[PDB]
Amino acid sequence: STSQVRQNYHQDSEAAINRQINLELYASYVYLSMSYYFDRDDVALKNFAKYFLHQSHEEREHAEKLMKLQNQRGGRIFLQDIKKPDCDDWESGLNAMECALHLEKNVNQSLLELHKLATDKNDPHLCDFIETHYLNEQVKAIKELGDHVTNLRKMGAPESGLAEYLFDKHTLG
Amino acid sequence: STSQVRQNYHQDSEAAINRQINLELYASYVYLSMSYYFDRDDVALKNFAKYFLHQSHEEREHAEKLMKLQNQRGGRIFLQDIKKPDCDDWESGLNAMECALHLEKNVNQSLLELHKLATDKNDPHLCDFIETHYLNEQVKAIKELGDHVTNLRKMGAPESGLAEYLFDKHTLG
Amino acid sequence: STSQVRQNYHQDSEAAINRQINLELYASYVYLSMSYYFDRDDVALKNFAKYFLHQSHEEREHAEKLMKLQNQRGGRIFLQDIKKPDCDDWESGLNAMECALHLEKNVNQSLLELHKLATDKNDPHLCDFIETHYLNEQVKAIKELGDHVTNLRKMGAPESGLAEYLFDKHTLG
Amino acid sequence: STSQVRQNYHQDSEAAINRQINLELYASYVYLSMSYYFDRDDVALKNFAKYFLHQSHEEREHAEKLMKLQNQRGGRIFLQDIKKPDCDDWESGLNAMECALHLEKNVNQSLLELHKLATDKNDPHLCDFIETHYLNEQVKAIKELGDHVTNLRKMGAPESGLAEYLFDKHTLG
Amino acid sequence: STSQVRQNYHQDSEAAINRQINLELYASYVYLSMSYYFDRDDVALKNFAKYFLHQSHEEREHAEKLMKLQNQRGGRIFLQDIKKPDCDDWESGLNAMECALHLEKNVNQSLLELHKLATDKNDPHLCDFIETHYLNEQVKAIKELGDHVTNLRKMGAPESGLAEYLFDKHTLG
Amino acid sequence: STSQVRQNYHQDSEAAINRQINLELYASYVYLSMSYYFDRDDVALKNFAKYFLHQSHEEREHAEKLMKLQNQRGGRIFLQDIKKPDCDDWESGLNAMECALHLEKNVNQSLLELHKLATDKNDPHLCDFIETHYLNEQVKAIKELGDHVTNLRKMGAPESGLAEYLFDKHTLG
Ligand SMILES: [Cl-]
Ligand SMILES: [Cl-]
Ligand SMILES: [Cl-]
Ligand SMILES: [Cl-]
Ligand SMILES: [Cl-]
Ligand SMILES: [Cl-]
Ligand SMILES: [Cl-]
Ligand SMILES: [Cl-]
Ligand SMILES: [Cl-]
Ligand SMILES: [Cl-]
Ligand SMILES: [Cl-]
Ligand SMILES: [Cl-]
Ligand SMILES: [Cl-]
Ligand SMILES: [Cl-]
Ligand SMILES: [Cl-]
Ligand SMILES: [Cl-]
Ligand SMILES: [Cl-]
Ligand SMILES: [Cl-]
Ligand SMILES: [Cl-]
Ligand SMILES: [Cl-]
Ligand SMILES: [Cl-]
Ligand SMILES: [Cl-]
Ligand SMILES: [Cl-]
Ligand SMILES: [Cl-]
Ligand SMILES: [Cl-]
Ligand SMILES: [Cl-]
Ligand SMILES: [Cl-]
Ligand SMILES: [Cl-]
Ligand SMILES: [Cl-]
Ligand SMILES: [Cl-]
Ligand SMILES: [Cl-]
Ligand SMILES: [Cl-]
Ligand SMILES: [Cl-]
Ligand SMILES: [Cl-]
Ligand SMILES: [Cl-]
Ligand SMILES: [Cl-]
Ligand SMILES: [Cl-]
Ligand SMILES: [Cl-]
Ligand SMILES: [Mg+2]
Ligand SMILES: [Mg+2]
Ligand SMILES: [Mg+2]
Ligand SMILES: [Mg+2]
Ligand SMILES: [Mg+2]
Ligand SMILES: [Mg+2]
Ligand SMILES: [Mg+2]
Ligand SMILES: [Mg+2]
Ligand SMILES: [Mg+2]
Ligand SMILES: [Mg+2]
Ligand SMILES: [Mg+2]
Ligand SMILES: [Mg+2]
Ligand SMILES: [Mg+2]
Ligand SMILES: [Mg+2]
Ligand SMILES: [Mg+2]
Ligand SMILES: [Mg+2]
Ligand SMILES: [Mg+2]
Ligand SMILES: [Mg+2]
Ligand SMILES: [Mg+2]
Ligand SMILES: [Mg+2]
Ligand SMILES: [Mg+2]
Ligand SMILES: [Mg+2]
Ligand SMILES: [Mg+2]
Ligand SMILES: [Mg+2]
Ligand SMILES: [Mg+2]
Ligand SMILES: [Mg+2]
Ligand SMILES: [Mg+2]
Ligand SMILES: [Mg+2]
Ligand SMILES: [Mg+2]
Ligand SMILES: [Mg+2]
Ligand SMILES: [Mg+2]
Ligand SMILES: [Mg+2]
Ligand SMILES: [Mg+2]
Ligand SMILES: [Mg+2]
Ligand SMILES: [Mg+2]
Ligand SMILES: [Mg+2]
Ligand SMILES: [Mg+2]
Ligand SMILES: [Mg+2]
Ligand SMILES: [Mg+2]
Ligand SMILES: [Mg+2]
Ligand SMILES: [Mg+2]
Ligand SMILES: [Mg+2]
Ligand SMILES: [Mg+2]
Ligand SMILES: [Mg+2]
Ligand SMILES: [Mg+2]
Ligand SMILES: [Mg+2]
Ligand SMILES: [Mg+2]
Ligand SMILES: [Mg+2]
Ligand SMILES: [Mg+2]
Ligand SMILES: [Mg+2]
Ligand SMILES: [Ru+3]
Ligand SMILES: [Ru+3]
Ligand SMILES: [Ru+3]
Ligand SMILES: [Ru+3]
Ligand SMILES: [Ru+3]
Ligand SMILES: [Ru+3]
């Protein structure tokens, strides 16, 4: 029962896109959790909260765009549970930034494995899709998180609550 | 280690709000799945797709607002996995509408159990919260879905593909 | 044959809402009658007439909103005759105001009995509905009518036709 | 005790205008009932609902204008109970339209009997009033309802739920 | 000698509202005192001063609204002395914030006792009043003060005069 | 421990300004009480109510300005309880106006004693302050209240409820 639209779209690619959909939903969920950590009355860094909420919404958009892709190509979306984040308590602004950096590196590695697969299956439409909409976004995200981690370290986080407060106001404000 | 803000907020209520957060995320996920079903090339009802996407985004907002509430009250958010939806293939516009109706009735029952709990624990702030932001939204959603199911039936869905097409254009367009 | 939308909505509540619909229509009719009393050539207080017409239209809106509620909840509207008002001739501006005060107190008592019923049947949606759209409107109406009755008395109504005339121009104008 | 304004206004005319006031209130009530039938979750034709609500409000205005007339002429308004409509359940859009057609024909017959009376009592002001504000409005209403009934029949109502749905969108939308 | 407007309004509720009026005036007075502490030449934190002045004005408004309520319901306002605040010298920005947090928790407890009373006397209008205009305002105030106390602590107040200065500029500015 | 700013500011002046702060708060409280008297359903003179509310807010501003002065000069604010007003029930519009006149004369006498003190202590800054911001405001307030009392008397208050009603509309409206 093949889709009338399907062309040059390997089953392995189809499956790999479904996995990537789950990973983008998971990254949305991590960032949601981080957001509301910083909204706790005992953490209380509102621009950290807003920053990660925005990232959360971005990752949901990234998921949606892969769902759209799956249907554009005539594959079939298969959803899996979205796992809860590894931590409930993210410790400090610095530790959350470090965790986001690791998350985005993990997501980039997935994307790079997906692009290898697409390359191996000679799917230039999928290669272009990944390159256009995902790989440079990931390089920018990683670089931004790296920059944030550096500033926080240099300022004396996580031990200086002053450092995290002023970063919240100047960089994320 | 009690929150400095916490007042008149029972542990049972705290836990019940965490459960409700998960249920709202789950409802967002159901609607996401339904949305992209209708975007499939072999279904191809774009206003059904847009309608459920909007509902999906609404449920995410409902979840966020409960997270905000949890922190406002000094409870602690505890996230759980977001289960995949029961179906991958929703059959027809009518069947998806019927499923959404059942979902929203289920969510309303949860909210009503939460309100009972709040009432039992004499938490009028929580009672007001639920009444203001959730109970009439649920009554309107249910009523809207009921109306949609009726129209679709009366028009001859799910067997008339014409019925579903014209409903898509006139009611959801 | 239960409505697909109905949930947590007791038959007693359903019936009580139908009674309240009739009472709001009746209050609209009382105010209509009062309005046109003041439009008589031998009464001739045009702002009393406009004031009660507006109240009449308000009560019709209150009825409509309860009809909407009945359907939102999946109950079935059952209409009864709208009784004529008790008086054809309302005597004076003061006496009409006094009668309106008594009418609004009667309507408030009905609403309060309805809210008791809803509370007894653990229907927080209905409780919220009544509180949001009816109970403070009734407290404001009562207070306004009380104020009007006082001013009229203090000014020397109903014996001073001058008092009623100047109240018409200054308070209702 | 005759009104200072009264002139050429027969007691029979006075009474007949009071009857007509009641009939216009009754027609408002019929249309109100029909409106909210179509707002039921198991009927769910929102432009039928809006259409009859508007008609309901129009009939209330027609009543008010006769009340105004009664006082302009120095007659005395005497109100009677507004009877509930004959049906609670109006069956279908077609059947409601048919019922409205019959209602408006009934109201027109009353108006025509009133005009005969006025003619017999040589009251040209009342004749003009009826002709100017009522008789052509009734001829237009009747003609409009006839047209609606025809279209619905021709489209295959009441058995085609599709017909009623598309009429709702195209003619009443 | 009962008020013509009074209905379903228990004497105990009446008295409890008078007590709450005094408590809101007292909270206005505390915040006034705190405001002008920060305007002292040896304290000199102008946005702390403005912040508490605004809170002071808010509490006066809360008092006024309860006075309005008392009259709306036909109770009789009975005023008592407004006690001076417990401290003349509030120590530091952090200590004032901590004191405000405790004050607002105290006021919330009063409101919650008032709502219990209203619930016990089956006064849903009063329940709604308290829920609508007071309980969520108190939850937001408490949460805001908690957040402020946290930031100040984390920044190194009250020992760091730098911390209090920069908080004044970034959070309260 | 003298303030770094303090110069030519006698301890007696400092104390006298604290007393005057209390008197201005007390006058705010009197006017608040009077305001809400006229908002009672059995008094019901809304422009009397608004008039005294505005006066109440003005007196609070006068207090604030003295607090500001105390700090400008390097004195230390010391607050005392704000006594409840002498009356709960102010009788009539005329009697309230008479009471306000006496209150403002009392406040003026205090200000004049303060100015004597400042003169005796050769504090021309304080003299100027009092003259600029308080003495002519008091002369205008007194004159205005005198005028109001006269009109009310001349119109036949407090026995004519008509007089008080029309004054409310024409002078305070
Ligand atoms: Cl293929
Ligand atoms: Cl393949
Ligand atoms: Cl799974
Ligand atoms: Cl890019
Ligand atoms: Cl970059
Ligand atoms: Cl770039
Ligand atoms: Cl608690
Ligand atoms: Cl607990
Ligand atoms: Cl889990
Ligand atoms: Cl809502
Ligand atoms: Cl609705
Ligand atoms: Cl609604
Ligand atoms: Cl039910
Ligand atoms: Cl039942
Ligand atoms: Cl009946
Ligand atoms: Cl309201
Ligand atoms: Cl009011
Ligand atoms: Cl109000
Ligand atoms: Cl006048
Ligand atoms: Cl005649
Ligand atoms: Cl005759
Ligand atoms: Cl009758
Ligand atoms: Cl016409
Ligand atoms: Cl026509
Ligand atoms: Cl025509
Ligand atoms: Cl009572
Ligand atoms: Cl009592
Ligand atoms: Cl006292
Ligand atoms: Cl609020
Ligand atoms: Cl908040
Ligand atoms: Cl909020
Ligand atoms: Cl800075
Ligand atoms: Cl000095
Ligand atoms: Cl000295
Ligand atoms: Cl004291
Ligand atoms: Cl001046
Ligand atoms: Cl002057
Ligand atoms: Cl002047
Ligand atoms: Mg926050
Ligand atoms: Mg991002
Ligand atoms: Mg992503
Ligand atoms: Mg797990
Ligand atoms: Mg962890
Ligand atoms: Mg981590
Ligand atoms: Mg690019
Ligand atoms: Mg950078
Ligand atoms: Mg598409
Ligand atoms: Mg929704
Ligand atoms: Mg929801
Ligand atoms: Mg599973
Ligand atoms: Mg299935
Ligand atoms: Mg299902
Ligand atoms: Mg309640
Ligand atoms: Mg609401
Ligand atoms: Mg609908
Ligand atoms: Mg007229
Ligand atoms: Mg009204
Ligand atoms: Mg009403
Ligand atoms: Mg009868
Ligand atoms: Mg009578
Ligand atoms: Mg009466
Ligand atoms: Mg309200
Ligand atoms: Mg009033
Ligand atoms: Mg509807
Ligand atoms: Mg019509
Ligand atoms: Mg008519
Ligand atoms: Mg009958
Ligand atoms: Mg029938
Ligand atoms: Mg019929
Ligand atoms: Mg014409
Ligand atoms: Mg036509
Ligand atoms: Mg200053
Ligand atoms: Mg506040
Ligand atoms: Mg307050
Ligand atoms: Mg003391
Ligand atoms: Mg102290
Ligand atoms: Mg303290
Ligand atoms: Mg609210
Ligand atoms: Mg905050
Ligand atoms: Mg008032
Ligand atoms: Mg003044
Ligand atoms: Mg003053
Ligand atoms: Mg005393
Ligand atoms: Mg006294
Ligand atoms: Mg006095
Ligand atoms: Mg001088
Ligand atoms: Mg001057
Ligand atoms: Mg003057
Ligand atoms: Ru690392
Ligand atoms: Ru079902
Ligand atoms: Ru009475
Ligand atoms: Ru026929
Ligand atoms: Ru504490
Ligand atoms: Ru005197």
Swiss-Prot record, chains A, B, C, D, E, F:
GO terms for molecular function: ferric iron binding; ferrous iron binding; ferroxidase activity; identical protein binding; iron ion binding; iron ion sequestering activity. Changing residue 24 to A: Reduces iron binding and oxidation rate. Expressed in the liver. One of its GO terms (cellular component) is autolysosome. The keyword Acetylation applies. It catalyses: 4 Fe(2+) + O2 + 4 H(+) = 4 Fe(3+) + 2 H2O. GO terms for biological process: immune response; intracellular iron ion homeostasis; iron ion transport; negative regulation of cell population proliferation; negative regulation of ferroptosis; negative regulation of fibroblast proliferation. Keywords: Acetylation, Cytoplasm, Cytoplasmic vesicle, Iron, Iron storage, Lysosome, Metal-binding, Neurodegeneration, Oxidoreductase, Phosphoprotein. Fe cation 1 binds at residues 24, 59, 62. The record marks 19 as: Essential for association with cargo receptor NCOA4. Changing residue 83 to Q: Reduces iron binding and oxidation rate. No effect on iron binding but the oxidation rate is severely reduced. Its main location: cytoplasm. SUPFAM superfamilies: Ferritin-like (SSF47240). It is found in: Cytoplasm; Lysosome; Cytoplasmic vesicle, Autophagosome. Pfam families: Ferritin. It is linked to Hemochromatosis 5: A disorder of iron metabolism characterized by iron overload. Excess iron is deposited in a variety of organs leading to their failure, and resulting in serious illnesses including cirrhosis, hepatomas, diabetes, cardiomyopathy, arthritis, and hypogonadotropic hypogonadism. Severe effects of the disease usually do not appear until after decades of progressive iron loading. Oligomer of 24 subunits. There are two types of subunits: L (light) chain and H (heavy) chain. The major chain can be light or heavy, depending on the species and tissue type. In the human liver, the heavy chain is predominant. The functional molecule forms a roughly spherical shell with a diameter of 12 nm and contains a central cavity into which the insoluble mineral iron core is deposited. Interacts with NCOA4; NCOA4 promotes targeting of the iron-binding ferritin complex to autolysosomes following starvation or iron depletion. Stores iron in a soluble, non-toxic, readily available form. Important for iron homeostasis. Has ferroxidase activity. Iron is taken up in the ferrous form and deposited as ferric hydroxides after oxidation. Also plays a role in delivery of iron to cells. Mediates iron uptake in capsule cells of the developing kidney. Delivery to lysosomes is mediated by the cargo receptor NCOA4 for autophagic degradation and release of iron. Belongs to the ferritin family. This is Ferritin heavy chain. It comes from Homo sapiens (Human). The lineage of its organism: Eukaryota, Metazoa, Chordata, Craniata, Vertebrata. The gene is FTH1.
